[PDB]
Structures are given as C-alpha cells and as structure tokens.
Design a binder for this molecule. Structure first.
Ligand SMILES: C=C1CS[C@H]([C@@H](C=O)NC(=O)/C(=N/OC(C)(C)C(=O)O)c2csc(N)n2)N=C1C(=O)O
Length: 262
C-alpha cells in the first residue's frame, strides 16, 4: 500500500461508498490504482466510447459528422437539454456528439448508439481498440440503473484509463478525430464540481462525467499540467442506497489526493 492508496482508502471509508481510481502518468507510464480491477457502472462516461466510435466511422465516411439526424418527440428520454431544443428539427452528428459529451444529453447518446447499430456497436469499437473490459448493453436511460453486482454497462477503472489515454493522447483515432475528441472533452460543461474541483486551476482538463442511481457519481479526465507530461485520471464512485445523493465532492477529493502524491 502506497501513501496515495492509504489516503484514497481513508476517503472511501469517510464516504460510505465504493471508490475506484486509476491514474496513468504518461511521463514514466506509471499507474496508481484503487479498486482498479473492480467493475463500476459507467453511466454517462460511456458516451466517450460512443462518440469516439462515430469519430472512427468518420475516418472512412469523411463527411459523417455533418450528417443531419432528426430529433422526434419519441426520441426524448429523461435528460435531453440540447436535443429538446431541436425537436421536430435536426442536429448533425457533430452537434449530437458535442451535446452528449459536453452537456450529458441522453437523447444525443441514443442517436450515437443508433448510428453505430446498437449498443453492440459501441462495445465493438472498444474491442477494436483493445479494451476487453468495457461493455455497453443498454440504451439511455436504463444504462444508468447502476445496480450493485449488475455487469451490464460497466467497466473497470484500469481499463477506462487505458482506453481514454489511447483515444486522446494515443492514436486509436485519426489525427483530426483525436483532436476533435480532445476539443470536445476540454469544452465539457458538467465537470466543475468533480475532478476539476480538486486540481490546480492552471491545469488544462478535458473530462466526461457520469451519474446514475445508487448515487453513482463518475468522472474521467485527461489532464495537461504545465511543464510536465499529461495524466489520465478515472474516478468512479457508487453507494449502497438506491436513492443515494450525488457525491461529486468525493471525485474532487480523489483528484486532489492524486495531485498531491504527484
Ligand atoms: C449530470 C448528469 C445528467 S443525467 C446524465 C446521465 C449521466 O450519466 N444520467 C442519467 O440519465 C441518470 N439516470 O438514472 C435514471 C434514474 C434515469 C435510471 O437509470 O433509473 C441519472 C440518475 S441521477 C442523475 N443525475 N442522472 N448523466 C449525468 C452526468 O454527470 O453526466
């Protein structure tokens, strides 16, 4: 047990829940893991895989991101802040990707899933880039049920950190696609109280949050400090009570502990 792992264990004990953390330091390719091989419900953090899968399609279909997609009343689900603005109209796949990633729009996510041929098309892209752990089983909004022990719509912190590294810092995507994903993540609007809240305010962050039942509160992030190699940080948190409140503060505290031990 390292110093950082003892503090993360203390944070978890103080929280009442179950915490999963994976850090990759790309300077020396070292890793910090806390419950790094346990499964956690992804919730909206799975939207990165779906957006990346559509970006991968656009490497062959070069104008794909410009393709209009109808938004119909039947498409609306539980949380659709951007798509509701375009019902009975269209959004492009670029606009749907940005809405899914930067506003956590669940209707937008369902349009990405449909473009990929169902949840199996998202999982397929994960396997194609070497992620053997990720599984997407359902569409929105039921993929956020986050039931303890349910393997559906889960991954592990170790696997998600490696995948996020390959998609953003690595070259699992083409050059313009990789840059587009980074731009989208940097422009996220839902992460101010999560990993970002625990990091020095001068560091540049791109991130995607997730939330669900059982007070499931997640965030995955690529971090660019000034003057050193970037980091990839995954923080997953879930709780014993189905109706538990969100705990974004736990993710901020985990990020702060990781930034300390660095
Ligand atoms: C803040 C949101 C808006 S909802 C959107 C999606 C996120 O992962 N979550 C849900 O749709 C969601 N589903 O749960 C229901 C209740 C639909 C379920 O699956 O039964 C949920 C629960 S608490 C919360 N906030 N969002 N996700 C998050 C996020 O952090 O990105």
């Amino acid at each position: 047990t390292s110093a950082v792992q003892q503090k993360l264990a203390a944070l978890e004990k103080s929280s009442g829940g179950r915490l999963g953390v994976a850090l990759i330091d790309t300077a020396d390719n070292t890793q910090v893991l806390y419950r790094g091989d346990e499964r956690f419900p992804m919730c909206g953090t799975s939207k990165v895989m779906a957006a990346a899968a559509v970006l991968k399609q656009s490497e062959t279909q070069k104008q794909l991101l410009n393709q209009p997609v109808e938004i119909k009343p039947a498409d609306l689900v539980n949380y659709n802040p951007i798509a509701e603005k375009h019902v009975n109209g269209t959004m492009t796949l670029a606009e749907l990707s940005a809405a899914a990633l930067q506003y956590s729009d669940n209707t937008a996510m369902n349009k990405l899933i449909a473009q990929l041929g169902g949840p199996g098309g998202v999982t397929a892209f994960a396997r194609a880039i070497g992620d053997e752990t990720f599984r997407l089983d359902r569409t929105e909004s039921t993929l956020n049920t986050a039931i303890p022990g349910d393997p559906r719509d889960t991954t592990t912190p170790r696997a998600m950190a490696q995948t996020l590294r390959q998609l953003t810092l690595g070259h699992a995507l083409g050059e313009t696609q990789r840059a587009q994903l980074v731009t989208w993540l940097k422009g996220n609007t839902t992460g101010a109280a999560s990993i970002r809240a625990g990091l020095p305010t001068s560091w540049t962050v791109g991130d995607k949050t997730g939330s669900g039942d059982y007070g499931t509160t997640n965030d995955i992030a690529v971090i660019w400090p000034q003057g050193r190699a970037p980091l990839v940080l995954v923080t997953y948190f879930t709780q014993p009570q189905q109706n538990a409140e969100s705990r974004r503060d736990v993710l901020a505290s985990a990020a702060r502990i990781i930034a300390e031990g660095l």
